[model samples]
Target chain A: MRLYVGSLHFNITEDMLRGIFEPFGRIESIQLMMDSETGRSKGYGFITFSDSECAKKALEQLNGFELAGRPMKVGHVTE
Target chain B: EHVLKQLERVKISGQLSPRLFRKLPPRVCVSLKNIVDEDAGHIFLGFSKCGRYVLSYTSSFYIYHLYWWEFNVHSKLKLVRQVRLFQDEEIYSDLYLTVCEWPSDASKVIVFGFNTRSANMSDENHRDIYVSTVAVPPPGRCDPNAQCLRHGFMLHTKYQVVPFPTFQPAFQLKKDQVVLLNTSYSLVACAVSVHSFCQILVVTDLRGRNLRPMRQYLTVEQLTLDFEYVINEVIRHDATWGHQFCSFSDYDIVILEVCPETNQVLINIGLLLLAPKTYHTSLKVAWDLNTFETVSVGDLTEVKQTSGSVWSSYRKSCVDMVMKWLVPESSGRYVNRMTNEAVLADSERYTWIVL
Candidate 1:
């Protein structure tokens, strides 16, 4: 299940995001977009989990969870 | 007794990848023939809102016959620059005349003709399209005095990959039109397309033959892009039509798709990513544009209200749809139907849309 995480703080690394969400589930992949020029996070990207239960738990628990001051907006990304 | 050997299987619908199709996937949306007949060795241009003015050599592909037009009630195609480029001892009869787009806004269309898959720099982006090098316009010169040509077309051999995640050049089957979406800094003046079956296959062959997962059945299967690609494949599912109309809003990515033959016009409002309140990020508005023979609507700024023509009719229907959705039917803030708030499909009959 892919989860769209929005308003992410640019400073938050991919591993950092994985660290925060790892407690809830097994992540399949995390696509954190980076700017080609300055080489920084686009602040919003997608995260995928192998199991749906973990994704559900993560969504319920981390919908408005804050990291690096900006609250992360979590939404179910339907493919 | 004969049926006693029948086994009782457990409910295992969730075990497989979700086949979310409410109907069996049909061959209606895409097919094979469309991919094979693409004559991509020809570049076309437009003057929509996004990259209305820009120039940049996209890749190492070239063709002759450089014609620029600013046609109004009476204007003609004026030949601009001619290039007879020959690469690698190949007779340039079929010069890969591809990857040219709107030149009005920035004068450079770097948002396209990029190969992001050569080195396999598997560092950040995993979903990057594995596109092989097709061709290019080379790092051509634009009189450096142009203030904003810097962002127009940065066609340099420096970065073999242009990791532009969003924009992909979407070519129209009939008009060979490419629509841009990166707003403000670029001009995006593309209407949409009317691709028949042959054009659907053109996309499959265009991008490294990799099939990306489509969102819905008989919807936008996938378009192997320019640089920034719009996410509306369901816009033009009809037979081939001509003279499409796509302009954009100042901030958001709004695509206007016109089908003169069937008389339906679709306005797809692609919500900007950074826009705070926009949650899901897309809106499609459609109405039957009354009558038309390729109604040339240059910009959305100056459409008169009281006319029997297609422009006024199209705009009127648009305003009507918005007005109905804005207010409570007749007057704004008139119907007070919600006391305990609302349910899904709480009141009016609304057309169910998925982005």
Candidate 2:
């Protein structure tokens, strides 16, 4: 299942995200869309998992977990 | 199927409802909360080329009330010669008026109002009311709002009023985009903070996931033109001083010094090139946003550092865009040298409260 993450910290990296979601299940992939020139996070991205339950569980625990100064946001890609 | 009972049975043997058209579970879709927190004020704002005055207006009505905002460092509202569109005008119709610019004596100014109808809208009684005006959006007033192009009119600036104070652009250039283009070179030169605001907007506009990324991207792209132009001019003029002081990107904080007292403008730059190495790594700081030859921000390219010629040539070209940033470039480690004052450029200076 694919999930969308927004309001990410500018410093959050793809690896950090993978690590955050890794505990939930076998992760398929993750991507942090970034600003091309600045080489920094574009504040949002997508993460996918092997199963929908893993994503749901991860979303349950991870959303609002503060990363850096801003709260982390994770949601299903539906919206 | 009823939501509570029937829907529960139809998870399709799929525990989580397999492929869901998906009613979002509570708080499941809160991430798209990002929208520019821009509040209501003048629909537009333009500063004078000389850098002391700004004329901006239009809030809630059929009329674009062009009011002047004077700056003796700070801003004050000044206005003149009122040309009413309706004699008593319609209370709330939406007609767009461009910007106000100056001519002789700097005492009088001109304005442009666009009166166009859609391809099917009526055009009978709106032949045209004429007045000297242009610069729809200060930097790009090239007939931006003209489908019907019936060409409305110009209203002049007359009597200057006693001083009042304040400050504020109208471009959300994202998604389908509400991009606003020119303003005033007067405001342009000392006004990078005004346009550099483009970057700050991206920073603040995204604090809560305001997903209007395309607008922010294009907005940055638009201002990047100005940056690209300034860098080019800085190179062409061989004034390396420009880049050293430019805080155009989020990486550059010199502008945070915030409108250093005018004369204290040029900072102790020889002492301010301090960066975190990554910034000065002599790389091509071009944008892939467009395929055009992006501006090259290679190393300090021989910091010959001269502001006089830069200043002379400065007053010449359309130094409005990012060059105005040079004015506030006068702070060193946040300390004003002339007055030896330390200004954080105000806590509420550039929406730092959210971060």
Candidate 3:
């Protein structure tokens, strides 16, 4: 089950987000937004899980959680 | 089920469900994601899953707006952005642009850009771009967006940087290999560390676990503290010294000592014959005696006694004959001297670092 995550705060990294959501299900990939000029985190990114059932559970558990000093918005990434 | 009812929704065909499609070919699968045909001349090559790449392949030209990363466009390739494919102008032939998908999920918005010519275009000109996808559900892990080529080295102690896979073809040691040899004489006078100006063997070995292992032997006090002046000189001018003694690997196992100051041979032993058991055993015995006094008595006195006896015999028969052979037989005599401080120091003060 793939998921789109948003509202990521600055300082969150690919590795950090993986450690947070990996336990819920099989995480497929993560695309963390980064600043073009500074090469720093852009405070937003997306995380995808391989299982649909796990994606459903992650939406429930992680949607309102605060991480890296910001609240996370989890949903399916739109095209 | 067609998800056209919503503005942005995933539509799966009856022929292939997302789960069963995992085994499909990668390029075909990633290409199949978020393919929203406007039914106009615009075939949006955006991440149908994500919105990173918005490519419009119309009859006139192919226009793409990719934003997988601002760092890629802003800092790396700050000079270039938004590549246009002019009516299949053989762009792929020149490899001017290509596409990459995040390894894990097919729906995420991540694409890279790269240029065919400029190697340092760290910006969006040739960077890959990806957009969020609704069908290929984003996975937790994906391939890195950057192309990292492992290169270069750093000497931590002195905070010096060097080219990795350092070359010394003459030294006979791989970039980071340890060599064990017995010295002909003691480097220390009263202490066991007096072998001052002894040839510190340096070899190049790429086989190391850590980045700083290249200079591990430099930590030895005899190397670091006793002969630091000479060592630093070598580090100071390593470029030339490295070029000269580098191919020495083809000849003999010459010793090396790292001196951040330059690459000067601290003490080049022209005729160093190392590791013969007879010589090494005798020398080790001498060195072992040099370490005693009490239950640990000074046996260095006995070592002196033994070497003095050997010197006596060596002088009677070998010196005249060896001196003649040394004059023209080899360059070793010119490169190194056993105990002459003036000759050895000349090589040190005005050595390859000067070159």
Candidate 4:
């Protein structure tokens, strides 16, 4: 099932993390929230993948992975 | 002997001798007094007067005139040492006025009558009087209790006759011997009278991060039906309807209300009414400025609320319609009819306006 991951650290690099979750599914889109005025990265982002099954697997595998010295949380998207 | 007696009389009744010896009272005589200097400043060197009367000497050479008058109550007062005429003539009349060092520390006014000839002045020469403020309070000190808003500190102004001639005569005058003036003319000379009118304005702003813009709307169902109900109710209540009154300004004044959240249109309540004998306060003129009148004018001074319930039904009905939706709104009331009230779907003619 497609899932949403939030509370990502500010310094997380897209290329470096894609390799970490390769075993899951194809990554659909990654959006890092940025400040409207300054266009600087805010401290959180959303990560979407192709299939719900792989997203679920990825969520279980990386629910609490230590990336760039900080633990990340993963969850589903809400309306 | 006549000359000597005339000199004696001049001494007795001390007054400023007129420039023209003929203009002076018959029994008067004047001498240059070897008065090489004619100044009212520096120590007012006393003029030796053996005659009956002698008056004090004064002068005006400052950006502002500095003059004073000393009254002697005692008859036997002895002559005092030399007193200054205008305080300090040299220090005054400077290019830039130095207020702190002004002559009269008491800071009062002196109204010395004018002269025509002695100083090249004429009998018809009169000073035009104008008013100006001397000082204002500091920024933070204007508190409510300061009596600053009292009758005294308010912005007070009066017309002053000035030395400069203006283009007043160019305009034609009314038959009543009064100069016809616009609102500008009344304030141009800087005078306020019973005819002067002023408006008080209040401004306020509400700010919030999640604030919504104002909106208003009127459903076709609400208005078309409401108008019919109003016309009927008014007819039923008053029983004397269809009074074919005049409509003043076509798209006259309208009051509007709006809702903040959805920014949707709210409701508009208007009155196709008339103000019969509205009087203008300043000019004391009565005008039927309401559009309903066969003749109307743009400028009508005062408006009085006349008693008549024929139009109230329409207003009340519109109020009911808006109240039904619980929509927030604002409204403007005017004294005429709407030019396009019929164009809107029998109910679509809702308007938004503010006064």
Among the numbered candidates, top TM-score falls to 3
Q: Native contacts retained per candidate? A: 0.00, 0.00, 0.00, 0.00
State which candidate has the highest lDDT: 2
**Residue B107, model 1: Cα distance from true site in angstroms:** 8.7
Q: Evaluate model 2 with DockQ and give the value.
A: 0.02
Tell me each candidate's RMSD, in Å, in order: 24.1, 24.2, 30.7, 37.1
Best candidate per DockQ, number? 1
TM-score of each: 0.21, 0.21, 0.22, 0.17
lDDT of 2 by residue, A1-79 (tens): 8998987657555545654455334455566777633434798888777678867766665566555456666778474
Tens-digit per-residue lDDT, B1-355, candidate 2: 3455645665555454412423222211111123212313443243343443444455444555554443332222333223332223233333344433322222223433333221115432222222222222222224324532222232221111110100112111111111222221111121111013322131112111112223211122333233335344544554454444443221111111122122111111111222322122222232222122333334452221322222212221211222232342111112110001001011111111111
Query: What is the Å distance of residue B254 in model 4 from its true position?
Result: 72
Cα TM-score of candidate 1: 0.21
CA lDDT of each prediction against the hidden true structure: 0.32, 0.33, 0.28, 0.26
Which lDDT tens digits does candidate 3 get at residues B1-355? 3224321333343453333333222221212223223324333332222322223223232243222211122223121122222212222211222232322223311222222221223321221211111112222332324223121111111011110111122221111121122111212211011114232431122211133243212222222212223223332443222221221110011223322123222122211112221120011001111122111111111112221223222221222222233223222211110110000111211111010
Off by over 4 Å in 1: A1-72, A77-79, B1-79, B82-113, B119-355
**RMSD in angstroms between candidate 3 and the native structure over all alpha carbons:** 30.7
Q: Rank candidates by DockQ, best first.
A: 1, 2, 3, 4
| DockQ list for all candidates | 0.04, 0.02, 0.01, 0.00
| TM-scores (chain A) of the candidates | 0.86, 0.89, 0.81, 0.70
